[PDB]
Design a protein around this nucleic acid. Sequence first.
DNA 1: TTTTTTTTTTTTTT
Lengths: 113, 173, 178
Amino acid sequence: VRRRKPAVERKISEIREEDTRVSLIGRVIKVDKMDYMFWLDDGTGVAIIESESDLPKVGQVVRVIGRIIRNEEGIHIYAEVIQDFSDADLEALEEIRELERKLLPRLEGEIVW
Amino acid sequence: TRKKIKDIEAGDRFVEVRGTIAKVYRVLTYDACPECKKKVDYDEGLGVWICPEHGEVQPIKMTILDFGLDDGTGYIRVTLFGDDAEELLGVSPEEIAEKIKELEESGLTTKEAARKLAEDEFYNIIGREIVVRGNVIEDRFLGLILRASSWEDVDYRREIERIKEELEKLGVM
Amino acid sequence: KRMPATRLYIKDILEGYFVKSEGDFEPNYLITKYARKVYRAKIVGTVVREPLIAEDETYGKFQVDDGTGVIWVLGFRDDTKFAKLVRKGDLVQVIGKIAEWRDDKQILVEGVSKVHPNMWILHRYETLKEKIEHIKKAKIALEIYNQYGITAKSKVIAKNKGIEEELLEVIDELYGIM
DNA sequence: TTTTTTTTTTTTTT
Ligand SMILES: [Ca+2]
Ligand SMILES: [Ca+2]
Ligand SMILES: [Ca+2]
Ligand SMILES: [Ca+2]
Ligand SMILES: [Ca+2]
Ligand SMILES: [Zn+2]
């Protein structure tokens, strides 16, 4: 039963070898309309996002959910979902990511039946 | 003043509740007096619209929206009127009146047509997070009904700050 | 009475224990690993696949991913309309009843609507706050249950510590299931 | 400040 693996939230610089589906959030810096690819910069790195149909605009803040593709040319993301994150408070998002990282493992470990 | 639905009582005044639209009971329009906003009666003998308080008046279409709201701690019925209801529904009262007329012509009463239009056309509004402000009246069988004076979109930064305050009380920050 | 919709991670729903009420009018509910009795679920995630509408329009379904898990959301008969509202990629908030089919928990759509990215952030903040609040209360209630069980004395002690009487029953029920 | 008055429940899926 190959159930859909939830998209693992990561930073471009923190992508792991074992990751197969990721959620990245960044700003578009370059769009290639002929090869349907775009360059996403999150502050921690730049990822080449291969899109099938939806191409964002340059300078737009977007959230990408995609599968990681590992080849001889490097690591590119085959985009599945591209959402407009232009009015998103990334400062608040970063703060909640740190809170979950710290508190979630402690909450699970509090179970003493 | 921000109050959780679990803390709401009958007769509550100026309560602010942030929650999710959970159910749509009825969507309908009625002819109202432009001054007192009360239901006007059409006199077939004189061909005019009569308001019990202001007499012969030019009627305006008033929208009524009855729905439910959930905040995670409780559930409350909500009613919006006119411009507030039209703003949330995104449809003009004249267009709603036309749809109610079509349903009534098919053999439905005003009550039946209002429930049907809410389920068939305004079901898209369900699942939306909003902030409602109003007074709580207690219906003898329907329970607590929040008569919302206004509604507005959620200010996410304001809400996040409230949650941070609660986290500080729990010893997180 | 209409019990509240609990804001939860999809993982907490998936790992829970579904309870099918034997009565034809009793609502079904779920008990999470943290002893939380849940009648309705309130989740925020992304629609990952283009909805599935049966040709005969008997059912409509769509998939929601929140980062902690993936769940199916179902609408039957005319309720198929809910699935038609969404599209692949939409960031949405879903409210509905928890259901279990083929030992896989799912959500019977009561409402689904597109949300702003800041709503997803607010959802995560609220979900974590509620989780911490509940765990701390359930930890104290578990100590009361292990010492006294479900007695008239333990119910008085639970009320004094801000714990609902229902919480002790949930712990007992979870112990019976496990 | 308003119209009209009966709350909520299950089960159905290639
Ligand atoms: Ca794409
Ligand atoms: Ca009062
Ligand atoms: Ca108004
Ligand atoms: Ca107003
Ligand atoms: Ca329904
Ligand atoms: Zn008048």
